[PDB]
Amino acid sequence: SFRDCAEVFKSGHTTNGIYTLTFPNSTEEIKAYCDMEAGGGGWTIIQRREDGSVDFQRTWKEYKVGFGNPSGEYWLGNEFVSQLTNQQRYVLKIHLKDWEGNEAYSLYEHFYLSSEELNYRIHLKGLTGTAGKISSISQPGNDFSTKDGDNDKCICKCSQMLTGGWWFDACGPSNLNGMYYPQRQNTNKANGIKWAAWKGSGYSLKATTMMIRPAD
Ligand SMILES: [Ca+2]
C-alpha cells in the first residue's frame, strides 16, 4: 500500500496516471492522479481544473471525501490530505494557466491542513514562484468553507458568493474552486477561478492544478 505518489514513484512506477493510495495506518483507499513525469515526479494531485466540468459547488462532506474523476477535474479530499500532511512535511505547488498561453506557479515549502475539528484550516510557509511574491491565499490561514459550512471571517457567506470550497478570508485573493468561465468571459468575474497575485482579481483562469510532495 502507498500513502502518496512519491511512495509509488520510489517503488518503480515512474509513469503518469491514477494510482490507488491508502490512508495512513488505515485500510481505507483513495484514488489520486500522480504526476511522475515532471519536477522529478512523485507529485500527488489534490485538485485540478482543466475543464471536464465537474461543478465544484459541493457540500462540506464532498470536499471532505473528495469528488470528480482523477483523470480529469477533481478534489482529492480534505480528510485524506489532512492525515497525509500531518504525518510528515509536504510542499504544496500550485500550477496555473491563463487563456493567452501563459503558465506560472506558486510553491510553499510547508503545507498542511488542520483536522476537521478545526475546519481543515490551511497552513502555509516559505513562498517562492512566479505566481506572486505574496501568497494569494490569506496568510494566517483560514478555516475551510463550503456552501453549507461558513467558516470564513466575513459577515457574508464567501462560499455562496464566490462558489466552491476554499479557505476564504473576508473571501480573499483566491479561489481555484470557483465557477469555470470560457475564454472571453474570463474578465471581471468575482465568481471565477482566481489567483490574484498572478492575473489580478477578476481574471478567471483556464486551468489549475494543486499538488503536494514531501522533501524527497
Ligand atoms: Ca461568513
Curated annotation (Swiss-Prot):
Resulting phenotype, residue 156 to S: In LMPHM10; no effect on protein abundance; mutant protein is not secreted; loss of interaction with TEK
GO cellular component, one term: extracellular region
Superkingdom: Eukaryota
One Gene Ontology biological process: response to mechanical stimulus
Cell compartment(s), UniProt: Secreted
Binding site residues for Ca(2+): 150, 152, 154, 156
Keyword annotations of the record: Angiogenesis, Calcium, Coiled coil, Developmental protein, Differentiation, Disease variant, Disulfide bond, Glycoprotein, Metal-binding, Secreted, Signal
Membrane-spanning residues: none
Gene Ontology terms, MF aspect: metal ion binding; receptor ligand activity; receptor tyrosine kinase binding; signaling receptor binding
Residues in Fibrinogen C-terminal domain copies: 2-216
Residues glycosylated per entry: 25
Disease affiliated with this protein: Lymphatic malformation 10: A form of primary lymphedema, a disease characterized by swelling of body parts due to developmental anomalies and functional defects of the lymphatic system. Patients with lymphedema may suffer from recurrent local infections. LMPHM10 is an autosomal dominant form characterized by the onset of swelling in the lower extremities within the first year of life. Lymphedema may also occur in the neck, upper extremities, and scrotum or labia majora. Gradual resorption generally occurs, although some patients may experience progression complicated by cellulitis.
Function as written in the Swiss-Prot or TrEMBL entry: Binds to TEK/TIE2, competing for the ANGPT1 binding site, and modulating ANGPT1 signaling. Can induce tyrosine phosphorylation of TEK/TIE2 in the absence of ANGPT1. In the absence of angiogenic inducers, such as VEGF, ANGPT2-mediated loosening of cell-matrix contacts may induce endothelial cell apoptosis with consequent vascular regression. In concert with VEGF, it may facilitate endothelial cell migration and proliferation, thus serving as a permissive angiogenic signal. Involved in the regulation of lymphangiogenesis.
Domain notes: The Fibrinogen C-terminal domain mediates interaction with the TEK/TIE2 receptor.
Assembly and oligomerization: Interacts with TEK/TIE2, competing for the same binding site as ANGPT1. Interacts with ITGA5. Interacts with SVEP1/polydom. Interacts with THBD; this interaction significantly inhibits the generation of activated PC and TAFIa/CPB2 by the thrombin/thrombomodulin complex.
Protein name per UniProt: Angiopoietin-2
Organism: Homo sapiens
Phylogenetic classification of the source organism: Eukaryota, Metazoa, Chordata, Craniata, Vertebrata
